[PDB]
């Protein structure tokens, strides 16, 4: 049965709660974003109202084949009424179409659900600043002090300069970027822009990108692999065997590959800066691991919460074990005592 952390008190609303069949009481199911864990259980067979962003709506319609009658897209940054209750969607700074949801309860309680988010100081000057928030449903993916990582901009700069240097040294080099869902599109779009190229990709991947309301998208991407010197491939193929295999398939038009694996955090964040990063190499193939995160670091998450001063915090990530919940509670109390709420 549907856990209390996916339920919104004193409404019949739920959030990211599609895997438990019919939730008793629920009149409206909210989807923060189009990642499989959050959408899990939704399909063309679902027949209840789904509320979400316009991008998330495009994806449900075209990829999942959810029938149009059940998709209720809502605009960003606008007060809307859903089943008699005032709501706002805000940009989560996660993947394309990802939202936080602000719920104004009839009794006067205000609740923020972050979905998945990368906390940022621009969120301190949104509609969030206009009133007190009593309860926060928080993306605790990286809620521990060892989780640091560079800015997205630092990582992109590094990728751009690296790719440009390699292709100017060898204009028969191919650049490859690994991918498994939506998110992190700026990595491959910024590399292509510096090389003057479109990004080549499979039919299924192109169809996904064509849903994302990216301006001038037709001028940036293509299914013609031949005509393009940046290719997307599944993350599972970003290894020496997979990359040599792909290189054979391209028909002798390239003689070298530079590949990037965008990742979350891995243990080598604790010593290395972005400038010190060096690839793994076997013959004419090099693989760079670059820590491009679309979740809050510890410092970013702490800042956000200390600004917001919630009366109660409800974690939505790593809640399955008592040790994790206990550890997280410890950090929330520290934050509260330091800040004075």
Binding site for Ni ion (CB under 5 A): 35, 116
Residue 95 or 195: which CB sits closer to Ni ion?
Answer: 95
Which SS3 state, helix, strand or coil, does residue 73 take?
strand
24: burial class by Cβ within 10 Å (0-12, 13-18, 19+)?
A: exposed
Q: End-to-end CA distance of the chain: give it in Å, rounded.
A: 34
Asked if 39 and 22 count as a contact pair (C-beta separation under 8 A), the reply is no
Which residue of the chain is nearest Ni ion when measured via CB? 116
Shortest Å distance, C-beta 297 to Ni ion? 16
Shortest Å distance, C-beta 314 to Ni ion? 17
Query: What whole-number distance in Å separates Cα of residue 75 and Cα of residue 90?
Result: 9
Shortest Å distance, C-beta 33 to Ni ion? 6
Shortest Å distance, C-beta 34 to Ni ion? 9
Residue 183 or 200: which CB sits closer to Ni ion?
Answer: 183
Shortest Å distance, C-beta 87 to Ni ion? 20
Shortest Å distance, C-beta 238 to Ni ion? 20
Residue 135 or 317: which CB sits closer to Ni ion?
Answer: 317
Residue 116 or 185: which CB sits closer to Ni ion?
Answer: 116
Residue 116 or 300: which CB sits closer to Ni ion?
Answer: 116
Residue 29 or 34: which CB sits closer to Ni ion?
Answer: 34
Which residues, other chains included, contact 336 with Cβ-Cβ below 8 Å and sequence gap of 6+? none
3-state secondary structure 163-199: HHHHHHHCCCEEEEEEECCCCCHHHHHHHHHHHCCCE
CA dihedral of residues 265, 128, 51, 315 (deg, nearest 10): 40
Shortest Å distance, C-beta 125 to Ni ion? 24
Residue with tokens 């996916």: 6
Residue 11 or 141: which CB sits closer to Ni ion?
Answer: 141
79 phi/psi in degrees, rounded to 5: -70, 125
* Element spanning 9, H or E: none
Shortest Å distance, C-beta 93 to Ni ion? 12
Shortest Å distance, C-beta 116 to Ni ion? 4
Query: What whole-number distance in Å separates Cα of residue 234 and Cα of residue 82?
Result: 38
Residue 97 or 200: which CB sits closer to Ni ion?
Answer: 97
Strand 7-8: give its sheet, edge to edge.
7-8, 13-15, 28-30, 50-52, 71-73
Residue 32 or 286: which CB sits closer to Ni ion?
Answer: 32
Query: What whole-number distance in Å separates Cα of residue 44 and Cα of residue 93?
Result: 28
DSSP string, 257-323: EEEEEEES--GGGTT--GGG---EEETTEEEEEEE--SS--HHHHHHHHHHH--SEEEE-SS-SSHH
């Amino acid at each position: 049965t549907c856990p209390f952390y996916k339920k919104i008190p004193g409404t019949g609303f739920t959030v990211d709660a599609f895997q438990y069949g019919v939730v008793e009481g629920c009149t409206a199911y909210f989807l923060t974003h189009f990642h499989s864990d959050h959408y899990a259980g939704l399909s063309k067979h679902f027949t209840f109202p789904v509320y979400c962003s316009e991008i998330t709506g495009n994806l449900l319609k075209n990829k999942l084949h959810v029938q149009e009658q059940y998709i209720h897209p809502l605009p960003l940054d606008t007060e809307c009424i859903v089943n008699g209750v005032k709501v706002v969607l805000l940009d989560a700074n996660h993947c394309p179409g990802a939202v936080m949801i602000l719920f104004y309860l009839p009794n006067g309680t205000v609740i923020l659900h972050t979905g998945d988010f990368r906390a940022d100081p621009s969120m301190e000057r949104s509609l969030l600043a206009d009133q007190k928030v009593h309860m926060l449903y928080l993306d605790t993916t990286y809620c521990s002090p060892e989780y640091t990582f560079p800015s997205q901009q630092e990582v992109i700069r590094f990728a751009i300069n690296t790719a440009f240097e390699a292709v100017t040294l060898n204009p028969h080099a191919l650049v490859v970027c690994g991918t498994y869902s939506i998110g992190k599109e700026k990595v491959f779009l910024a590399i292509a822009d510096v090389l003057g190229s479109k990004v080549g990709m499979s039919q299924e991947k192109y169809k996904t990108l064509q849903c994302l309301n990216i301006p001038e998208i037709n001028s940036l991407i293509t299914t013609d692999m031949c005509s393009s010197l940046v290719h997307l491939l599944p993350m599972m193929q970003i290894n020496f065997k997979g990359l040599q295999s792909h290189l054979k398939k391209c028909g002798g038009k390239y003689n070298q590959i530079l590949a990037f694996r965008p990742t979350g955090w891995t243990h080598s964040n604790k010593f290395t800066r972005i400038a010190d990063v060096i690839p793994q190499t076997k013959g004419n193939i090099s693989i760079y691991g670059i820590p491009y995160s679309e979740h809050s670091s510890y410092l970013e998450m702490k800042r956000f919460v200390q600004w917001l001063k919630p009366q109660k915090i409800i974690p939505t990530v790593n809640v399955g074990t008592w040790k994790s919940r206990s550890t997280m509670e410890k950090y929330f109390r520290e934050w509260k005592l330091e800040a004075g709420y």
